[PDB]
Design a protein around this ligand. Structure first.
Ligand SMILES: *[C@@H]1O[C@H](CO)[C@@H](O[C@@H]2O[C@H](CO)[C@@H](O[C@@H]3O[C@H](CO[C@H]4O[C@H](CO)[C@@H](O)[C@H](O)[C@@H]4O)[C@@H](O)[C@H](O[C@H]4O[C@H](CO)[C@@H](O)[C@H](O)[C@@H]4O)[C@@H]3O)[C@H](O)[C@H]2NC(C)=O)[C@H](O)[C@H]1NC(C)=O
Ligand SMILES: *[C@@H]1O[C@H](CO)[C@@H](O[C@@H]2O[C@H](CO)[C@@H](O[C@@H]3O[C@H](CO[C@H]4O[C@H](CO)[C@@H](O)[C@H](O)[C@@H]4O)[C@@H](O)[C@H](O[C@H]4O[C@H](CO)[C@@H](O)[C@H](O)[C@@H]4O)[C@@H]3O)[C@H](O)[C@H]2NC(C)=O)[C@H](O)[C@H]1NC(C)=O
Ligand SMILES: *[C@@H]1O[C@H](CO)[C@@H](O[C@@H]2O[C@H](CO)[C@@H](O[C@@H]3O[C@H](CO)[C@@H](O)[C@H](O)[C@@H]3O)[C@H](O)[C@H]2NC(C)=O)[C@H](O)[C@H]1NC(C)=O
Ligand SMILES: *[C@@H]1O[C@H](CO)[C@@H](O[C@@H]2O[C@H](CO)[C@@H](O[C@@H]3O[C@H](CO)[C@@H](O)[C@H](O)[C@@H]3O)[C@H](O)[C@H]2NC(C)=O)[C@H](O)[C@H]1NC(C)=O
Ligand SMILES: *[C@@H]1O[C@H](CO)[C@@H](O[C@@H]2O[C@H](CO)[C@@H](O[C@@H]3O[C@H](CO)[C@@H](O)[C@H](O)[C@@H]3O)[C@H](O)[C@H]2NC(C)=O)[C@H](O)[C@H]1NC(C)=O
Ligand SMILES: *[C@@H]1O[C@H](CO)[C@@H](O)[C@H](O)[C@H]1NC(C)=O
Ligand SMILES: *[C@@H]1O[C@H](CO)[C@@H](O)[C@H](O)[C@H]1NC(C)=O
Lengths: 466, 126, 126, 466, 126, 466
């Protein structure tokens, strides 16, 4: 037919899969007042990007949630913002002293897990010490290193690090984060609903920036996420390897109330040149455990439906939910950050004694009914990121602590190498904080555009001046 | 407005209508997080200038669609012309031709556009 | 040397002689005060490259005075030719014309230079 | 004639008004010796920028001094350089002990306002404390919580913060600063003399950089500024609203001598691992209070002329100058920074007793005579930026403190809304530190060049190959 | 590939064949060492853009070897043509011609390419 | 022939000699494990750049090792990496207390260099102090300001500064650095043999980066360098002025073994709360001094040959090598750093007793025999960079300290201004640490490329459209 020649195009639509920095954009409204939030300080940018989603169509490509780097980018960011927010604040180094602790007597009774500690401080004058007292929860306190006297105690941190107080202006709010591609990269969404975390997504869309991610931390139930829009979904890097965590997404959230009832007063204490440190005060009385409430009907149906979805991966056997495996409260309990208090709630009352989720679809209905109720511990001395990042002391909050949230997903594993005869068992377990990001970022990828291209065509030459 | 990458599933003969819409977006823009923004932007500028310089060496500077005097080799690719332009996406073509990048670029430099500009200087000698 | 902005009071037919004088100054350059220099310089370079890319899409790359085939609409302006060039400053004309920026650019990009490039490729087809 | 065509120009002379970073250029000669001056450290670029003023002509545009953002660029910059200058230095935390204070005795007399305080320190060995003494001015000192013994005192700061001593290398010198625009921005001077702070300036010139601004801090008189070269000028955002500060510029300066007479010795005291701290010593004697002298012969005329100028805004009424209204010395006195000591001078002796400025023109003539003399307090513990930034301790200076300055402007307000019958009254006031910048940057603007342009002409087409 | 600077000993008539090989490497790229790398890279990009802007003002933009209409003045140099191209290096020539830098640039900016652009607009006037 | 016209070339091979920032690059393999190596931290890029050397040929230009800015670039980088690497670590502030010290006793011997000190610390609890002890080398210790009891002692630093302990992960490993010039510069090597530090080098090569520099600090013998590949070489800025140091390079290395024999145990002590501090412990017994062995055979030949080379600059006279002049061990001994202990070894046993280097060629051989042996002081409190940078405490190393090195060059001076009859003399002296860099960066330059050029040719014009 005709001779063919190298012709050159710039701005060609093509890309390669590659790692990059991402910009941390925000809803603009926080940084009017919320100076240095513990998550999302004003290091993140008040750009408030409109979600300019564009359907590509006719393109299909391989997403993978497990090998994803945006999760590691978020893990290194959230740690950085936590450390940045604590570094300016008061250090409890001069508070690490001999504490004499007796009982917390309140209004014809005694509080269950708080002790009443007397201790020594300086005034604003280095050579003038004084005595004063503060209430501490038993998990923050330990018997003094030699047991000479059953009333001598110390603050827990002293043999490991000096905890910074979290400044009152530096809040714990879970504000939405939008991650944005720098120039020459695009973010891709997988819009192919019922995609199960890996492989060829059949339906793909571009965006400049992600949906509003919330940097929430809890370790057995997930909180305040995005629902799976079609059906309940199970995700794991290998379901047959029982050590791989099994993230589950709900289609209808369960409403959880987490609460305290005590009435409580806040106290200010100093050992210095000037500073303030906040400490716990005297009480007005009716007495209950701090607790959380879940609807029996809604929960029952929710664990039933997950049993059916797991039976499609594990056929001809009965699936039973059970207690968290063992160890200390830091992994065996549902962690939290409600209202500015770090709750730690037992769940052995909740993942319990359940028969075949498919056969339970027979039951699957009730009238209005009583709450499942979870007993909670609370503590103030925190080693937040599983040992890494600084120790933090959370200052106490006066009076009215309570919050309401949506359960949107669960962090299961299968049980150990049992006989497995007619049966399989599943347990809640918390793992690494990364899974709290994978349970939102699973449907994203970042790609680098490679805008040059060469192709044959019948354009013969750039004949001089033609 | 088809939008940024809005033709990535379209045929090469339809995607090659949109080159300005995309190319206008290859360039945009108590704390160290400013070092993210600077290290991202200076890299995005540096990548863009490496494309512009490379288009200057081949003799296309300031064009998007451009034509050159180098003929095709059947070893690079050899299919019917409609099976290219009327039929496949740039994303699909890129995965076919990718062996002959660096081969074609080194051929465009000395063995075409330097040589055209040698002959131009020997001509304007008059 | 007529000086940077030194023609800002002159008629457009006089000020349009100084474009090199001005254009050469669009591009120049224990503590975090070094971030002032870096963040200013990267933004200055980014603004200059946005201008040069924008002239390249219109087809004017490497010119200062450039001529294009888009005709005037009397809605944009309708005054006499000397009542522009012999009569007022660029700074004054800008505050007359400033509505029809974006409109004129959208008309230049596709509805001129993309189409000039479609026709050039179809000519060099031979 | 013919059809007209879109033609395009680059490098066109046009601009828009916009906010930007400015560079802190400086005289190059400082950083050879003066490592980290408190105002313009070597973070300001040694450059000595040439004053390439260019007159534009036929251009006339809206200047405004009150809304000007270069004032805020300076306010944040000066605060930033102050904190960078303090951060390396010795913290007076270990000095906050019980002070026992008795009188200071010299030539068998008692000094006016310096108490002699004995206190305790560690040596360089932590388990070896010692006793020693230093003199402190009464304003740096406060009685300890109750006068169980009346001679117990503390250093003032300790119930609020911890003060860094100013490092001896780091001078307070008010060296000139040149503000310069980055590429693609231009700085415009208003050269239309008698421009009164806002409106269309009929004569404009470009510069790459401002004149050399001295960053001089004083709070009632303004010191060492630029004069108004045509005539006295009165500026305020609204003269009718009495709550808006009235900045006045003088045409001829008044020479002020500010001085001390004491002869004084400097002492070095430590509480540490090693560091040095500087403290005040024993005295050699002939004694008068620290003071400033203003020549009556010049000052009389100056408040007369300003009175005539104010009467062109306040017609057919007599003008009186009166005392600063009320508050602590930190607002009611003329603050300073003379020779490395922080003076605070009374002005109720100066803004006094003065009748109709127009009628006083009938006087306006004298032989040379005595000085108006101002009594001055001094203090070393400083909260410089009205409590913004760190607390600073200024170390004492040996012997020969004296400096000479030019009054160039005043900061006034009108009096309160009394009956004002046939009369009006004015008082000096400090306000915010910004007005020490507006009293130089009044005639400036920054503009962004917009160098692209489109225009009609008969250039028909870019005809192919033509 | 003779390599970067790989002809600095060669005669001007040989070294002037390498220009792409060298030009293609004028553009490359708890802690303050991030500020070093940024402040080197932004300065390297600023120097390259100052050169490309200056070539555009002379009218050469995109060309490496470029012809212009400015005549020689025998005061700047006057040795026979073979004593340049056939005989000595670019580096040795630089240390001969070095006085006439700036003098030749003002002659190229206004006194050629502005005048060419004035006359060009008066041609495309038709 | 014809008219000649200005023609323009971009990318012309031409350069100007100028100063620049330089990149630090390394072999990739360290920062897999070796976080914050004291020399070459991960602030040096793990590029592992290839030595792509390119001989230019037909080019000749002037080099100068003495004025070379790369030396100053290295000095300001090495100090910065030192200070930044110490700033995170534990400060020996609360250790500065009254030490009470007696003899270190082992298997009825007494260790002459080490004293045994009791001292007091806080436990982790601020109000509970305890007694404990550690061994300190006599140089780190000084008697308390008044000897009330002669056994009262202190740690040496306290009347100057607070020392940081060098953190346990932060190694002194002298890993290779490659210096690389940034874009649009180039690095030129002089490849001419026997280039003597200044003058026109006849044979020049481009490289992108230097050979592997080791940043080794030792102050009378140079260590682990690159040999002069043809002859022994002498370099100085002016040999006739005896004030200029005389750097020598050896053609053949002399192998030095530097060793300790003690067996010694490493002890941990706390005064804080977040921690590791390391202190010196109890001993198992045979007693021998820290020492170094140099082979007489190799050393004699080496100082013989250097005597011939010096005689070619100092004709018809005899040469003798002699003791270092005087001052403290910090200048008069071979400072070292071996394996993490700072040896300071005497050399008056070694630069001794030597006659005419030309006549000693009559000896020039032996059957292999006994070593010259050097005695060594050791110390832990270090002011590393001759008084600049932080004070460092180097934590003790357990058991197996021994290292082996190559002597590759020497730092001489000539002797003082005697009659010099028939004789001249030379002495070891360490000088400023820069000469540990000049003995590698001698053959090097950085150049800036200036790629624009203008030249005459017969190309008539860019005729319109031609
Ligand atoms: C899952 O998501 C839910 C929301 O969707 C979260 O629940 C909310 O949590 C926030 C705190 O993180 C709660 O905010 C606090 O509410 C207090 C009460 O506000 C109401 O009542 C006052 C009058 O008394 C009204 O003025 C006000 O408009 C409300 O009607 C406030 O007193 C608190 O103020 C403090 O914080 C703010 C910032 O939020 C500061 O600006 C203030 O100065 C002050 O320090 C605070 O606003 C909110 O009430 C919760 N809502 C519900 C329904 O529970 C869950 O926390 C989240 N899950 C997890 C794990 O975080
Ligand atoms: C309004 O503007 C005036 C100037 O127009 C300022 O007045 C000057 O203020 C500076 C300090 O701010 C004074 O400088 C000091 O002068 C002392 C005396 O110097 C003379 O005597 C020595 C020999 O004894 C001569 O060598 C010298 O040339 C002078 O003739 C010095 O002892 C001071 O030294 C200290 O500072 C310098 C830096 O300046 C350091 O290098 C030294 O190491 C040392 O620490 C100092 O130089 C100056 O004398 C004042 N001039 C007059 C005429 O008064 C006002 O300060 C300013 N107003 C305000 C509000 O700041
Ligand atoms: C989560 O639920 C478990 C299961 O009930 C709680 O732990 C303890 O479990 C044992 C059975 O394995 C319970 O039975 C027995 O109690 C008697 C009490 O005297 C004891 O002597 C036996 O050795 C045995 O433990 C036990 O009652 C139960 N403990 C409690 C407090 O209920 C677990 O408490 C729940 N998790 C949390 C964090 O509370
Ligand atoms: C600025 O000037 C004022 C006005 O003189 C000073 O304050 C005090 O003002 C009162 C009048 O309101 C003066 O008169 C009386 O003095 C006698 C003294 O025995 C006293 O009994 C009266 O109660 C009344 O105070 C008073 O003399 C005057 N004080 C002084 C020391 O002059 C003011 O001191 C001046 N400002 C500063 C900062 O010094
Ligand atoms: C480097 O070698 C010198 C020279 O030997 C050592 O210093 C001392 O130098 C003197 C001569 O100036 C030596 O001679 C004499 O020794 C007798 C011993 O009874 C004494 O009575 C004399 O007053 C004189 O000192 C002396 O032996 C020598 N000392 C030692 C310990 O060798 C120097 O010690 C060597 N360098 C270092 C750092 O040790
Ligand atoms: C070259 O072609 C083969 C066959 O299509 C392919 O497997 C290989 O990955 C290609 N390599 C590149 C760099 O394109
Ligand atoms: C648009 O035109 C009107 C009428 O001339 C003018 O008032 C307005 O300021 C113009 N707006 C812009 C954006 O130029």
């Amino acid at each position: 037919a005709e001779n063919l020649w190298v012709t050159v195009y710039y701005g060609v639509p093509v890309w390669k899969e590659a790692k990059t920095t991402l910009f941390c954009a925000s809803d603009a409204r926080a940084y009017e007042k919320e100076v240095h939030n513990v998550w999302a300080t004003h290091a993140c940018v008040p750009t408030d990007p409109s979600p300019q989603e564009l359907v590509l169509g006719n393109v299909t490509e391989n997403f993978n949630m497990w090998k994803n780097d945006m999760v590691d980018q978020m893990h290194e960011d959230i740690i950085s913002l936590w450390d940045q927010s604590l570094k300016p604040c008061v250090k409890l180094t001069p508070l690490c002293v001999t504490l004499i602790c007796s009982n917390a007597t309140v209004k014809n009774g005694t509080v269950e897990e708080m002790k009443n500690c007397s201790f020594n401080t300086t005034t604003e004058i280095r050579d003038k010490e004084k005595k004063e007292y503060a209430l501490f929860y038993k998990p923050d306190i330990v018997p003094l290193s030699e047991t000479n006297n059953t009333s001598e105690y110390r603050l827990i941190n002293c043999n490991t690090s000096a905890c910074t107080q979290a400044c009152p202006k530096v809040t714990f709010e879970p504000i939405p984060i939008h991650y944005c591609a720098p120039a020459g990269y695009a973010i891709l969404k997988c819009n192919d609903e019922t995609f199960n975390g890996t492989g060829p997504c059949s339906n793909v869309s571009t965006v400049q920036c992600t949906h509003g991610i919330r940097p929430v931390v809890s370790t057995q139930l997930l909180l305040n996420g995005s629902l799976a829009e079609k059906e309940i979904v199970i995700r794991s890097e290998n379901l047959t390897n029982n050590a791989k965590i099994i993230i589950v997404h709900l289609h209808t959230p369960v409403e959880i109330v987490c609460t305290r009832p005590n009435n409580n007063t806040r106290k200010s204490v100093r050992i210095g040149p000037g500073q303030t440190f906040y400490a716990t005060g005297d009480i007005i009385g009716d007495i209950k455990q701090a607790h959380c409430n879940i609807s029996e009907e809604k929960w029952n149906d929710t664990l039933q439906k997950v049993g059916i979805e797991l039976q499609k991966h594990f056929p001809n056997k009965t699936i039973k939910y059970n207690q968290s495996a063992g160890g200390d409260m830091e992994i065996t309990t549902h962690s939290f950050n409600c209202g500015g208090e770090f709750f730690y709630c037992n769940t052995s009352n909740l993942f319990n004694g359940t028969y075949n989720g498919t056969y339970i679809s027979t039951n699957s209905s009730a009238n209005s009914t009583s709450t499942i109720t979870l007993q909670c511990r609370i503590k103030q001395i925190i080693n937040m990121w599983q040992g890494v990042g600084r120790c933090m002391y959370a200052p106490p909050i006066a009076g009215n602590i309570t919050c309401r949230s949506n359960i949107t997903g669960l962090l299961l594993t299968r049980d150990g190498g049992t006989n497995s005869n007619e049966t399989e068992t599943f347990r809640p377990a918390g793992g690494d904080m990364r899974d709290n990001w994978r349970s939102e970022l699973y449907k994203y990828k970042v790609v680098k555009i490679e805008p040059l291209g060469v192709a044959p065509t019948r354009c013969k030459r750039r004949v001089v001046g033609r | 407005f088809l939008g940024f990458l809005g033709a990535a599933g379209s045929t090469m003969g339809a995607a090659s209508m949109t080159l300005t819409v995309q190319a206008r977006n290859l360039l945009s823009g108590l704390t160290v997080w400013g070092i993210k923004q600077l290290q991202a932007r200076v890299l995005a500028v540096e990548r863009y200038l490496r494309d512009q310089q490379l288009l200057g060496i081949w003799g296309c500077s300031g064009k998007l669609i451009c034509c050159t005097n180098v003929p095709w080799n059947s070893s690079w690719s050899n299919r019917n012309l409609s099976e290219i332009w009327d039929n496949m996406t740039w994303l699909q073509w890129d995965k076919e031709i990718s062996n002959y990048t660096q081969i074609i670029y080194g051929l465009l430099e000395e063995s075409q556009n330097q040589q055209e500009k040698n002959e131009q200087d020997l001509l304007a000698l008059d």
